[PDB]
Amino acid sequence: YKTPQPWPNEGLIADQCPLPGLADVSFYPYQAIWDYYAKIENIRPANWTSSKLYGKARMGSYYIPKRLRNINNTHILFCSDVLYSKWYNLQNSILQNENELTKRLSNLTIGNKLKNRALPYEWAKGGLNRLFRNISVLDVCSRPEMVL
């Protein structure tokens, strides 16, 4: 980052992710964001409130733990393949992808830092999505860490 700037809110209000159904087994395929979901209980102990444990986030929404928002964090890393652009088709053989990545990571890089030509324009000025792609809105129910 240029300067620290963590997540200000306490609860994520996003309804694009299907909620678990009435049945115990999930009819839909598993969604990652369910790991940060507050479950509604029909039977409750005496004097149970969301302010005591679940913060200010309204029930039925998503609550973000404390360790995912720090004033004092300064650097992020990720060893993932999901940010790659349209030129990383999975059906292609591994050798072709490796060769193309090796060829691309030489023209774009100066020293060891990436030129602004490759990063998305939202992240920094002058981008053209040469290496990374944009972030969609449907890409939130399986990769909460990236959006957060």
Partner: protein, 119 residues
């Protein structure tokens, strides 16, 4: 919207008590959002924009670092040092699942010091 937050417990045993939430919980229609996004049917839509961060970013690639640093300090030392750097947070990042391999640090030094490990 339905009433205020409520707790009702008329039974003598206080271990189990009834809770009436502030808002409705329509768990029967669990596909509302996904079908709503595709604009299959018209309906309410609420979008609000909030700003969190400013200024530009900088990104470094570890693969180019491996290639460049291995030339002047060998291959064992650079790999060992970069593994130590990659396991800063007390948990390995490579072992983590691909869909959830995201984690941050607190003021690390990059590139790290490469020991002069004799072969």
């Amino acid at each position: 919207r339905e009433g205020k937050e409520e707790v009702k417990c008329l039974t003598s045993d206080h271990t189990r008590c009834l809770y009436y939430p502030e808002y409705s919980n329509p768990e029967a229609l669990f596909d509302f959002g996904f079908l709503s996004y595709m604009r299959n049917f018209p309906g309410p839509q609420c979008i609000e924009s909030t700003s969190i961060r400013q200024q530009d970013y900088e990104v470094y690639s570890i693969y180019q670092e491996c290639k460049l640093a291995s030339k002047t300090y060998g291959i064992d030392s650079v790999l060992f040092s970069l593994k130590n750097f990659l396991n800063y947070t007390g948990k390995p990042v490579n072992e983590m699942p691909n869909a959830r391999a995201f984690v941050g640090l607190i003021d690390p030094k990059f590139p790290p010091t490469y020991p002069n490990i004799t072969r």
